[PDB]
Amino acid sequence: FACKTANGTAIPIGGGSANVYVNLAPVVNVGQNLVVDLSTQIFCHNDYPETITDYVTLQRGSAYGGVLSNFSGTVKYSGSSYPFPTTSETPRVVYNSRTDKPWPVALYLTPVSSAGGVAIKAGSLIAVLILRQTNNYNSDDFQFVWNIYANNDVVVPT
Ligand SMILES: CCCCCCCO[C@H]1O[C@H](CO)[C@@H](O)[C@H](O)[C@@H]1O
Numbered sequence: 001f002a003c004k005t006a007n008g009t010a011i012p013i014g015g016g017s018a019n020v021y022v023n024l025a026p027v028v029n030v031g032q033n034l035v036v037d038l039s040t041q042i043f044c045h046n047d048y049p050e051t052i053t054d055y056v057t058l059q060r061g062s063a064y065g066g067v068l069s070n071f072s073g074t075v076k077y078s079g080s081s082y083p084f085p086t087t088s089e090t091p092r093v094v095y096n097s098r099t100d101k102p103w104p105v106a107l108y109l110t111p112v113s114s115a116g117g118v119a120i121k122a123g124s125l126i127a128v129l130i131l132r133q134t135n136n137y138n139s140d141d142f143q144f145v146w147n148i149y150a151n152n153d154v155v156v157p158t
Pocket of ligand 1: 001002013014045046047048049052053054134135137140
């Protein structure tokens with residue numbers, strides 16, 4: 001079980017961390033959702049599906065910078081929605097394929113009442129998401145740490 005990003009970076013068997021760089025809608029109004037779809041950025045696979053079943057959760061997601069300050073968040077994990085920043089670990093998604101496949105996570109972020117102007121700055125850390133991986137084979141319990149960075153400013157009109 002390993003993962004890779006669209007940016008070309010990767011995290012190998014056993015876990016670790018990597019940086020993810022996302023383009024964001026440059027203008028977002030109060031009452032609108034800014035979407036950060038990591039499912040197009042983060043992909044994982046099972047290295048031995050002939051024998052082993054891999055289990056994957058979103059263990060925890062934290063908001064940083066302008067996302068923590070200026071937005072109200074929901075995270076969608078495999079069709080289900082949760083508070084973001086997260087209050088609990090999600091149920092498991094099953095990975096039974098060697099073809100690299102999306103980690104099904106999306107952030108839905110809507111401006112708070114006090115947001116206005118540049119609510120997210122380019123190059124700033126906006127989130128950390130921890131993918132947790134186990135299996136039905138042994139005692140492996142690994143963390144894949146995704147550091148999410150803004151590629152561009154996001155403006156909330158006033
Ligand atoms: C002839 C025995 C081969 C033994 C191969 C074990 C491979 O383990 C890796 O790949 C497994 C399948 O993705 C993961 O469940 C496990 O955590 C680790 O990432």
